[PDB]
Amino acid sequence: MERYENLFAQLNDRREGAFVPFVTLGDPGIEQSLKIIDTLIDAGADALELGVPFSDPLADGPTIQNANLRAFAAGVTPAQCFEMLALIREKHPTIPIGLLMYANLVFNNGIDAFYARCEQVGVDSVLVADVPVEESAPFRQAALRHNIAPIFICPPNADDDLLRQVASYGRGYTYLLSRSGVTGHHLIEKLKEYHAAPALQGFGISSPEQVSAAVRAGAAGAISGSAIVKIIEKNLASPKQMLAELRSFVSAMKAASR
Amino acid sequence: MERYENLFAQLNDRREGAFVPFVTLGDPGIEQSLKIIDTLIDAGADALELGVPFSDPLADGPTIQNANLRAFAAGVTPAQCFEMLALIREKHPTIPIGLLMYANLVFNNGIDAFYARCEQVGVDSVLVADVPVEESAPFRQAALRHNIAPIFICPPNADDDLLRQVASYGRGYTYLLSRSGVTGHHLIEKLKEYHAAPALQGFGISSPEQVSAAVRAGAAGAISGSAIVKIIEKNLASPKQMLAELRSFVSAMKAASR
Amino acid sequence: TTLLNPYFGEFGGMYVPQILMPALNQLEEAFVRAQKDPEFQAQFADLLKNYAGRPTALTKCQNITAGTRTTLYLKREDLLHGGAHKTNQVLGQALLAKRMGKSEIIAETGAGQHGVASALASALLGLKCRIYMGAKDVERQSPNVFRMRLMGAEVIPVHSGSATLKDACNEALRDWSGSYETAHYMLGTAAGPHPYPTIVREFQRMIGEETKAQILDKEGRLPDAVIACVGGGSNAIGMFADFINDTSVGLIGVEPGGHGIETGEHGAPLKHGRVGIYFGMKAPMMQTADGQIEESYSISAGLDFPSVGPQHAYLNSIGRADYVSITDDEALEAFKTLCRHEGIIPALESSHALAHALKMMREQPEKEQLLVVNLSGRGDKDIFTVHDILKARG
Amino acid sequence: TTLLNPYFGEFGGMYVPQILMPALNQLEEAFVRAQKDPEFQAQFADLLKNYAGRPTALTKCQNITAGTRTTLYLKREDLLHGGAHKTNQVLGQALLAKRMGKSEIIAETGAGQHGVASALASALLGLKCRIYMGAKDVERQSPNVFRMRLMGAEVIPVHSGSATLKDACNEALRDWSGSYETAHYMLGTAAGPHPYPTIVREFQRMIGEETKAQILDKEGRLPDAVIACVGGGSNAIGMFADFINDTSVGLIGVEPGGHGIETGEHGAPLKHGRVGIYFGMKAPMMQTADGQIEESYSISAGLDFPSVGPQHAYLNSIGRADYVSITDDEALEAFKTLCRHEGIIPALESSHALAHALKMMREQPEKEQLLVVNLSGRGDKDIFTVHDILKARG
Ligand SMILES: O=P(O)(O)OCCNS(=O)(=O)c1ccc2ccccc2c1
Ligand SMILES: O=P(O)(O)OCCNS(=O)(=O)c1ccc2ccccc2c1
Ligand SMILES: *Cc1c(COP(=O)(O)O)cnc(C)c1O
Ligand SMILES: *Cc1c(COP(=O)(O)O)cnc(C)c1O
Ligand code: NA
Ligand code: NA
Structure with missing residues (x-):
């Protein structure tokens, strides 16, 4: 949580939104993934959304489905992901790190133990893709006990009741879904009215103009995943070129938030 | 009919039974079949039982099933069979000629017309394999109108009623079945008591001792088919040898009837 | 006697x-x-x-008859143990x-x-x-x-x-x-x-008896006609029997027309064969001019009997029942139609009966008629046959 | 809420x-x-x-139980349109x-x-x-x-x-x-x-409701146990539901044991898996030590769901229902047995349930018991699978 508060406070004083890229840990390999992440940060990423490879990412489109597959082809495990996370944290002390998880990986060795591991590694938030507010209790409680922000999702059709729940239970940032489906304005005002965590718009954000639009609409920033991952997928044969493209894309998206 | 009466009268004066072989007309070919038949006669056959090739001989075992098949392979038709019959009659004026038919071939162009054709060609009797006494009326009537003997079958389990019917309706000779199934003593006395046509035992007769036994039991003679046909089947590649074997077998079977 | x-x-x-x-x-x-x-x-x-599993259902097929004045019911012998009557x-x-x-x-x-x-x-x-x-x-x-x-x-x-x-x-x-x-x-x-x-x-006989009780219950009257495919004649006579004395009820038997009656490659001896004596009975059959017995051709292996039940030949002769034929293509079309519109995969044999019913409906769309087709069996067994044919056509 | x-x-x-x-x-x-x-x-x-085609029959299987004190009935979902429950x-x-x-x-x-x-x-x-x-x-x-x-x-x-x-x-x-x-x-x-x-x-639920009415009619009492295979749990809960409050009636679910539980190649998550959260529910499932979801193996493709219905996990936890497993070979044997002794070809899925019933009977031949096996479907679809296996064994 803490790191998000500081980030948004700083970004506000500079009148700019945050640009948060998403990537699957270990895709296409542990070493290359660590380089990709350092490139993303050096290029302007304000925070990171990192996925732990899962066998059945039922909320992700083909692009990320393949990221998980490439990571598995590399033998990337949750334990190795936590090793990567510790290192990333040791290298970058202030950048907020959020994990994109699927319930079974959090529940597997005990929910409380999972968030405890997140805390010791330096993770700031955890978004469990297949855990709606209705089933969130155990997750948000464990998160808070270990100073981890539990990320809640505000869908486009969210009614007043949901908005109020997302506003009171969430921390770090509120995930503002751009649309229904999987990965590949009025609510913003309501969230602010209910003192919800700063909103980050996600899903379908792949161009600089979308980032500027999100900030203009009142969002604190925007998240982009598939657009980032596509760059990795298209440059698998050329590691160096992959980083080059990533840097150019991230710098462009970040510039749009200023 | 006429020819059977004379034959049995003559055979009686010589205290001997009749030996009647069966063969399928046109098996293995028209020419060879005509030679086979002349061989059978020259070797001692007292009468002949001749089958007209039929697509579904449901009362015949494998041996004769194949005789029909070989005849069909030769393109032998009922019309050609009648041409053969006329010739056989023109060559042998006194030998009784009986046809082994299946109902459809008799019914095909009209029952009356079939027996009329039999008469003009010189046939003496007709046995329709799949026509029991119960369905015999039209057949026996047409037969009698054209001086053709309708052959009736006396099965081994024949009750008194059947014996009486076979005795009054039949002519030429009474077919005494050796057993149930398909091709491959007290009744004899009952038949004589009812003035039935002389009995000829058939089915399974393949050795000289069987012929002598039939005559001893009181039968007027014996019919042999498969045994004859097997000789044809085993010597297809050697026409001359086929006739030689046929002559030796027929002469042996006939000698046993004396 | x-x-x-x-x-x-x-x-x-x-x-x-x-x-x-x-x-x-x-x-x-x-x-x-x-x-x-x-x-x-x-x-x-x-x-x-x-x-x-008797009694078998009598299914009203509403989709297939949409836009016409035909009401069609299918006697479900396809649901009988074994998949056929x-x-x-x-x-x-x-x-x-x-x-x-x-x-x-x-x-x-x-x-x-x-x-x-x-x-x-x-x-x-x-x-x-x-x-x-x-x-x-x-x-x-x-x-x-x-x-x-x-x-x-x-x-x-x-x-x-x-x-x-x-x-x-x-x-x-x-x-x-x-x-x-x-x-x-x-x-x-x-x-x-x-x-x-x-x-x-x-x-x-229970096929027809059940159909009568079921149609009377659901429609309050007898059908204008009951339709069944005829291979040897058992499912058809089974459906017909109890309706023989109900003179207002039409009895329609459907023989396989194969590639077309005029092609000589069919299995319709009752209407296009010739009376003969074989298989222990006198009945119309597929035979050569010489009297040799021939085979019956049909896309449906089950309608391959080269002759037909004697009672059908009789009912036809006196005009109590009418017999028609349906070609391979017509049966295939009925098969495809029932699958798509009613979610029932019919036996290709039964598809011949359905095909004629479809023809009665389509040729005279405004004719009010209550028809019952005997669905003699299911067609799971025919999916490959239908599959191979369709593909060979692009 | x-x-x-x-x-x-x-x-x-x-x-x-x-x-x-x-x-x-x-x-x-x-x-x-x-x-x-x-x-x-x-x-x-x-x-x-x-x-x-409901209601489906409840068939008494007299041949298969000869020489024992077991009376076995099969709820015939194999006769339902489609061939399965x-x-x-x-x-x-x-x-x-x-x-x-x-x-x-x-x-x-x-x-x-x-x-x-x-x-x-x-x-x-x-x-x-x-x-x-x-x-x-x-x-x-x-x-x-x-x-x-x-x-x-x-x-x-x-x-x-x-x-x-x-x-x-x-x-x-x-x-x-x-x-x-x-x-x-x-x-x-x-x-x-x-x-x-x-x-x-x-x-x-009608499976169990019909079974209750039918067994009461034919035997005048409830069964000692109702047995059903468990892939995802629908046919089993369908059979179980109406008997849950009849405490004297045993409820036995049969998961596929594949090549044997000890081989790790099976599909029995309820008794041999581990509780996890996937496919929108918290239930026992086939998963790696890390929490990755695994596949369920069984000779029967239909029992391939890698998890199990939540209500089954619950009924098990409170001891209301008991769950066991049956291996590929045991299911194959039950399949062959029903074909030969009752003239019914069961789905390999259902064969798992029959197999356990056969085991209950054979292990204690003199135990008087009234059993009902849910025959969830027919096995015409499995004849090739069974054929290939048998031949590869000489
Ligand atoms: O640009 P994209 O590919 O459209 O989206 C990127 C997804 N990454 S993410 O933000 O980590 C992310 C992933 C899946 C989710 C499913 C349900 C709730 C929220 C989710 C958040
Ligand atoms: O020696 P085999 O092969 O046993 O029998 C020879 C059959 N020829 S036959 O006598 O012309 C003959 C053929 C078939 C029959 C079926 C039913 C009634 C009588 C029949 C007579
Ligand atoms: C056997 C069969 C038929 C043909 O025989 P009939 O005796 O004419 O009924 C028709 N439909 C099905 C499904 C069959 O199995
Ligand atoms: C689908 C199927 C099953 C397995 O699923 P449940 O949901 O566990 O019933 C069992 N038997 C048959 C015949 C099936 O088709
Ligand atoms: Na026919
Ligand atoms: Na399962």
């Missing part, structure tokens, strides 16, 4: 070798006695209900065999459905079952052959003749003529020598 | 992305209203009776979809049976049906794929993950999360997020 009339007008009879007459006489007597035996009827009803009569015949003290069953089969039905009935009732099947049919019906064997039946290929159904029919009779003492010949259709045409009709 | 409890003890729940909650809430409300609607119940009953609930779900004003259907399928059932229901009720199937499953189930297409369904191969059932399950949810406005997700078993476990049970 006999207890019942072996003839339906000029058709029928008992044209079998003399040696088999005692077997037919015994069977007729056992049948007549069984029909008057409350215990036999109770056992048969028990098996039909608790084992086979054949099961009804094999259960009755199996009981008859046991009533006569027989412990063995002999059966003939073409497509293999009757063989499967005979095998399942024999397995259930503890009868030793041996089945005769044409060699060409054994080769083309591997699934059904394996089913028969799984149920303990002995399958015997017949290589004589054309190695098809008629040939299997001959081999069955050859065997029975020498074993009738302990074996019963479970004939597969409403044909052959008396008393089979009669016995098979009576053991399939 | 919700109208009904989403949990059965600790199992169940609604673990789906936030975006799908409105879809689940709408479905639950539509279900609850439908259950109180006499018109809905009448329409559903009409379809079950006149289209699907799946048809019952797809008809109810299709009606629910129409009640909600939906015109499209999304379904997942492994062996292909649910896909076929979904397709036939959609064809009948005028719904546009699209089915997701694992690529490896599409390749191995060509027959079922063709059937779905013949019935107008759109079949979509899934190449992600292991390209099997669980993967198809994911793709179904991905699609629905963006189309629930006009499409209904016809889940194939008594699992997944609430309200599916409850809805599927209630739409299969």
